[PDB]
Design a protein around this ligand. Structure first.
Ligand SMILES: OC[C@H]1O[C@@](CO)(O[C@H]2O[C@H](CO)[C@@H](O)[C@H](O)[C@H]2O)[C@@H](O)[C@@H]1O
Length: 405
């Protein structure tokens, strides 16, 4: 009886003052002019709070060379780590992995500094290492057995890394590459999460739920190609490397193919489930923007209902509709903070497919490749409201006071 984001929900999607972020302007200097960075995630403790080692926060980003064409960054994505004392001025720590990383390239995941001090960097293994032609095979992997050393000079991630595949789609609850109808299947973005109530350990991910041909599972056969879902796995032992697949938390069948970078924020007594999604990944008959969509339930595996009636929590303005993507929500005292990356700006009207037309120079310099100004939002049951913004990629601790409104 899997909770569903319905077409009746998506029909109501609409930009409002409460969901539209201000215009993102490029930052005054680049932390790494040589590197474009997107899809960023935080080094968290087991409960999910932002980890702090010797006064440093650590974050992870997908990175590619700046001189590389934006549209192709996905084929050569490499995980770099950055560290900061304040939350604003990040230092490049370089690549996280020195060795046998899984897949031809690495896609987004999450990071855990366990109570025992062991580091787990969950990532998506895209393709297979040293493949001839690029494949779009996605498997949830981890680089376990890391050490995080912090002096007063910086942070180094050291020691031998142990790389292993954690999960591949079953074929019943989560669609495999073979079963993929319509657009390319999804099985990526592993996000670690300890339920503060049960104490049980889970791993959320983006998947697709298989729909047999002629199933009539939808009011139009073409719509059933859009079978995006938020999958979850459980660790009985709590070991961050031992997982068993569970039933999906939420399905967007007949609505959207890509329910990207799923994550849960628990607030007072409620579970808010957030997913980033594209306008181009919407089923026909539906019109929604690139945005963060959100659902709420009284339990982690509960009857999720969409925030603001439609599910749209946060989106870009009409006149810069691709300026940010890959938003991650996290709690700060009484606020919710949301950090995306600075995506595509100054298009003048152009669609994403049209950007590929432009000269290499004209394509670079319509791409930020930095952290977006982190948005401050207020949750009010099943209703959300944008309250303001902070500096570009400010990730503060709960111990830090934010500017007044
Ligand atoms: O680069 C992989 C990384 O990007 C995300 C979020 O931006 O997905 C993007 O790239 C995928 C692969 O090309 C596309 O399928 C998707 O449309 C696009 O949003 C994450 O899902 C992933 O971790």
């Amino acid at each position: 009886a899997t909770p569903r984001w319905t077409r009746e929900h998506a029909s109501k999607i609409e930009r409002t003052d409460e969901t539209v972020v201000p215009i993102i302007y490029p930052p005054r200097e680049d932390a790494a002019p040589e590197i474009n960075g997107w899809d960023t995630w935080f080094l968290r403790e087991r409960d999910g709070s932002i980890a702090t080692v010797g006064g440093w926060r650590v974050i992870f980003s997908l990175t590619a060379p700046a001189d590389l064409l934006p549209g192709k960054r996905h084929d050569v994505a490499e995980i770099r780590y950055f560290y900061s004392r304040d939350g604003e001025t990040w230092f490049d720590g370089g690549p996280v992995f020195e060795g046998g990383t899984r897949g031809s390239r690495q896609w987004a995941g999450s990071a855990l500094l366990d109570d025992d001090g062991r580091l787990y960097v969950f990532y998506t293994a895209s393709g297979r290492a040293g493949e001839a032609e690029i494949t779009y095979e996605q498997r949830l992997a981890v680089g376990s057995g890391g050490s995080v050393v912090a002096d007063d000079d910086g942070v180094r991630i050291e020691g031998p890394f142990a790389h292993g595949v954690l999960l591949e789609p079953d074929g019943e609850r989560y669609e495999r590459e073979e079963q993929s109808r319509g657009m390319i299947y999804t099985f990526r973005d592993p996000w670690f999460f300890e339920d503060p109530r049960s104490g049980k350990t889970y791993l959320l991910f983006e998947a697709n739920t298989p729909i047999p041909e002629g199933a009539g599972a939808c009011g139009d056969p073409v719509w059933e190609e859009f079978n995006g879902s938020v999958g979850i796995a459980h660790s009985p032992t709590g070991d961050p490397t031992d997982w068993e697949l569970c039933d999906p938390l939420l399905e967007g069948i007949c609505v959207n193919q890509e329910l990207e970078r799923p994550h849960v924020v628990v607030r007072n007594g409620f579970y808010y489930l957030f997913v980033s999604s594209h306008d181009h990944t919407f089923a026909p008959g539906l019109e929604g923007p690139d945005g963060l969509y959100g659902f709420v339930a009284d339990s982690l595996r509960g009857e999720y209902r969409p925030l603001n009636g439609s599910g749209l929590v946060l989106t870009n303005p009409a006149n810069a509709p691709y300026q940010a993507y890959s938003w991650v929500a996290f709690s700060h005292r009484e606020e919710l903070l949301v950090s995306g990356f600075f995506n595509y700006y100054d298009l003048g009207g152009l669609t994403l497919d049209d950007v590929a037309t432009l000269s290499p120079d004209e394509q670079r310099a319509k791409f930020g490749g930095t952290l977006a100004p982190t948005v401050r939002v207020a949750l009010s049951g099943d209703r959300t409201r944008i309250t303001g913004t902070l500096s570009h990629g400010r990730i503060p601790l709960e111990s830090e006071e934010l500017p007044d409104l």
